[PDB]
Amino acid sequence: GVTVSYFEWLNNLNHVSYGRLTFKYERDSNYHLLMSVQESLERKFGKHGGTIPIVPTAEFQDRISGASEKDIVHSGLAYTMERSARQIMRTAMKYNLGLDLRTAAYVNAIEKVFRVYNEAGVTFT
Amino acid sequence: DPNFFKMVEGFFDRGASIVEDKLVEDLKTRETEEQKRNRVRSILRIIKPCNHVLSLSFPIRRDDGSWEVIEGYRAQHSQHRTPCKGGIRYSTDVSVDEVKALASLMTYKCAVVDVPFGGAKAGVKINPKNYTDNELEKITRRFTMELAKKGFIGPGVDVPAPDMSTGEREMSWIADTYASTIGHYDINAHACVTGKPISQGGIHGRISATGRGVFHGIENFINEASYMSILGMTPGFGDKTFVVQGFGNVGLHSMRYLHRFGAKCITVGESDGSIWNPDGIDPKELEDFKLQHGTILGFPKAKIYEGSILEVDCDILIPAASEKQLTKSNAPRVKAKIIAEGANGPTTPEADKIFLERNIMVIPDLYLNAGGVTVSYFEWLNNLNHVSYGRLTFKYERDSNYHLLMSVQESLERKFGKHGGTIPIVPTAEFQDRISGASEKDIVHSGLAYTMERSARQIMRTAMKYNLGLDLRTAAYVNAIEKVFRVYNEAGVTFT
Amino acid sequence: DPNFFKMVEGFFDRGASIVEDKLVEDLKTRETEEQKRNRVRSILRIIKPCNHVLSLSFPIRRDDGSWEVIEGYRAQHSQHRTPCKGGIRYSTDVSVDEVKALASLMTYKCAVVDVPFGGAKAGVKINPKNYTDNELEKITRRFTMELAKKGFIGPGVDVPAPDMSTGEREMSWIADTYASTIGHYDINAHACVTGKPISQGGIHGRISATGRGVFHGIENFINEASYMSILGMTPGFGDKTFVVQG
Amino acid sequence: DPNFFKMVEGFFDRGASIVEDKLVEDLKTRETEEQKRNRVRSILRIIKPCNHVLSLSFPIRRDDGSWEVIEGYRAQHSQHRTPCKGGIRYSTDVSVDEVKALASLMTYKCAVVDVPFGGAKAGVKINPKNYTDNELEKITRRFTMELAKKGFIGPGVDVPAPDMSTGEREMSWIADTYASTIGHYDINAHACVTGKPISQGGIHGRISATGRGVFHGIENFINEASYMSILGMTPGFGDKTFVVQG
């Protein structure tokens, strides 16, 4: 809930919900890709006259018709919580910490908070 | 022909006598069954009047060295969501009673389409016909200084917009005056007005905003299987005629999109004539014939018809004319099964009752006419992100499409590929005309068709949750009130 | 080998003697055929000079307790689209004539690529070779305070950038000085300079920016079927050699 | 007949070669006898140059619909005591070299009479003879907007004053322009310029200010018993003639 609290702060700071300007645009681009695969096949197998009905799945349809802001949030979260684990796994090797993860958690934090004081000139003198 | 300010306030009082009951029940608090009544009736008295109204006076100096006193107005209806958006009108008949009305009308108009900022309106008692082009910018530049010093213009307070007698060149003069006196240290300075020309922040495809709106307004209802059966026709614009009154801004830009999708235009009338053709009229040539003349009297490919165009055979009639146009005069004489409104108050409350008695599905103006309010919200964001739409994504999303096709090609040629036959997966001639010309204009005409659709499904719904049948206008106001209510209730209106 | 400030201004005057004619015709207004001429020639006199030019003077205290006077400049060419963007140069030969030039040059450079903000430029008469790393941050941190108090730095006014003798570590010192004295109550505080290191807002793939630029610059022309036939070669980088100076 | 900017700076360098010695001795600190020398010589290099100098450019629209470019200057010499006060001059021969001079001259003029604010000066290359009364207020009203947005006018920053070719009616136009655009929420708005007419804040007995000054200037010396004996006369204006040029 810290991550989503960061997404709410941006929602309130862009003055628009997520995806309002893009859902119906990205919807049309999907159907033009399918209609492109259909046409392209029926130029090779098409003399046989067999139609090839390329259509979305019953799940990918349940993803288009109900595409809301809620999806982008539950996505940007699953991307944070993953890009961040790979950095704890890594640090747990660069220092040979084995299966001590808690220490590797704090070691990432300190090592990133350090790179901000160092390259800033902490003192204003 | 009733007074107007009574009409608007007449709907609110009517639409609050409906929602009041289903709204007490859905409250959560420790109160009596009667303390809630005193809570609902009470908030509904706070939403009704207009919070702020101003009134000005200008020392303008005419071109001949004279002086005179200009006199303006601006009313902000609600503050529940900031800023407030509302046009500026130049007319010698801009009272303070009609500014309060139109302000309240936008707070509900921009609520049925889920556009955040609330409602406002301004007016100036002049006649732009009687002024030079240097007298106008004197009046406009000062009307902003004497209005931003009292906190009625700003990227987060009010955002004026164009209106009658007020084109783009009046939005340029407001923005430069603001951006260089008082909003100088403000990064969002140029987001104080919408409708500006393209060269200074304006969006593309703005003059066709109410046009595209009126189109997508009816498409969401023509496809609705339920409301069609009652009217007696089939979904889709196939085999559907229509007619157009007032051929101009809202009319021309709406004939096109309808005519492009099957709907056969039939008659197009104006304030100074009308045209009749049971065979179908081509909008382009109809425009072209006026692009050099100024009137449509005597079009080649369609004969003459004079009198009332509202009393004409049709299937979808649109009144692009002015208010108070269709009443008990001819309410049993329309012959059409749909009346989609295009302007403010085309219909008197009398004809509304007759239309319920005649299986006519009148579509409210609060919804359809939404249109250029939505794009005015997109321009405000364009000016507030400091970048056009999609600049950072068009070429990125272009490559991702070609890698999908090249993926389908490879994957097939691993199964059928031993036969050696190549499989040229390539875009269509239309989907190519969509990649090479992908601009900002596409995103706007998309985010609009998504607003105008997500919003209809909410009016259809409310028209069932209260069993309103084919009364849509009431369902429009009922959605607005029911959403504006959920903001005062969960906020603690009083600061005490 | 001509003077430089003459070269730039030489192009503008030349390029305005061309557009002037095709530009009168595409005007819409109620004027004569000669009142328009007096309108075009006139705006083209307003775009040419530089609106604002500043000039500073610093009491810096050397490491050995001494004092000396640093001397800077900053010129904002146009205000037609805000903010203004322009690098900062440290060099003992930064006149006020070359700052006006390079400022005007960016207002047109960032117009052919449709980047909104206008042009600016700054300079400081020092030689970074002759200063420690604590003398530099003294010069840089104060050059911003004596420049933001007069409204020449800010997320919506000016956005300095790196240039010769000015790397990233000079963009860190400007941002922290601004973000903690005068832009404290400002949500966009750290948007006052670009070129910062990655750890403090900088973008990825910035040192290869002019690189990628130079590449895509020529690719759009090599593929142009018309301009190639005249030169006498075929489209595409196939069979095409090239050479590189510097 | 020597150059002027050399004269002023010539006095300062001369008058600092005198005070420098009696000034080291009256310092209190833990330093050498030579670290003090490096402290006095050093501050005297900081007082000498002019901190800030600006330079502008105006799009004014003449009465006949034409356009032209006005070109101004303003130099604030010192910041040691704020605001800064300095007149505005309209003349076709207002260089940037003479604005630096006269600015420095006031920082010392208003120090011998213990008036707190420091020195400044402005100029505009026009000839008021060649302009109507609506062209002047166009030039004056905009010269303030393009000068207060960069923090060079204000009740606590700079306070312009009249000068040659600049009467009261030019101080009215500055005050109203400031008090209604940028100093609107400021209680001290109308304290941004002096010399205004009486009906808008001006003091009484202002046109006779340098007059009364010149009088009391000599009276304090005529009565001084010492300096008179050397000259060879008696105190008091009794039996004393005088003459007046200009």
Ligand SMILES: NC(=O)C1=CN([C@@H]2O[C@H](COP(=O)(O)OP(=O)(O)OC[C@H]3O[C@@H](n4cnc5c(N)ncnc54)[C@H](O)[C@@H]3O)[C@@H](O)[C@H]2O)C=CC1
């Ligand atoms: N469940 C329901 O009955 C409704 C749900 N929604 C949902 O809202 C989401 C996105 O809607 P947005 O408004 O775009 O996003 P948002 O997340 O920014 O919406 C904030 C809330 O304020 C309401 N709202 C919007 N504009 C308003 C205005 N001017 N005055 C008063 N209330 C206003 C919206 O309906 C929404 O509930 C979707 O999840 C959509 O389904 C919208 C309407 C009805």
Ligand SMILES: NC(=O)C1=CN([C@@H]2O[C@H](COP(=O)(O)OP(=O)(O)OC[C@H]3O[C@@H](n4cnc5c(N)ncnc54)[C@H](O)[C@@H]3O)[C@@H](O)[C@H]2O)C=CC1
């Ligand atoms: N343009 C816009 O973005 C919006 C316009 N509106 C409203 O739409 C109405 C008009 O649309 P506009 O966009 O202004 O287009 P317009 O200004 O181009 O409309 C004028 C048209 O109406 C016709 N007309 C006028 N009075 C008539 C009468 N009594 N009978 C028959 N025809 C008549 C004219 O001949 C002409 O074709 C107005 O009520 C306006 O406030 C409402 C919201 C947005």
Ligand SMILES: NC(=O)C1=CN([C@@H]2O[C@H](COP(=O)(O)OP(=O)(O)OC[C@H]3O[C@@H](n4cnc5c(N)ncnc54)[C@H](O)[C@@H]3O)[C@@H](O)[C@H]2O)C=CC1
């Ligand atoms: N039709 C034509 O000749 C041109 C059309 N365009 C169009 O502009 C759209 C997007 O361009 P953007 O600038 O990204 O979007 P925008 O919508 O934000 O552009 C605003 C307008 O200002 C101009 N502009 C941009 N940066 C400028 C600068 N620094 N100084 C002065 N003018 C500047 C643009 O060309 C554009 O007309 C597209 O529709 C593109 O085709 C751009 C250039 C020429």
Ligand SMILES: NC(=O)C1=CN([C@@H]2O[C@H](COP(=O)(O)OP(=O)(O)OC[C@H]3O[C@@H](n4cnc5c(N)ncnc54)[C@H](O)[C@@H]3O)[C@@H](O)[C@H]2O)C=CC1
């Ligand atoms: N003992 C001495 O040698 C002197 C003593 N004074 C005394 O100062 C008192 C009142 O003087 P005010 O200045 O009216 O009062 P104040 O109390 O406000 O003076 C503050 C100090 O700053 C100095 N000062 C004034 N204007 C200045 C300017 N523009 N730049 C730099 N320094 C400036 C003054 O001489 C004074 O020492 C009296 O007690 C008077 O005798 C003034 C001059 C010399």
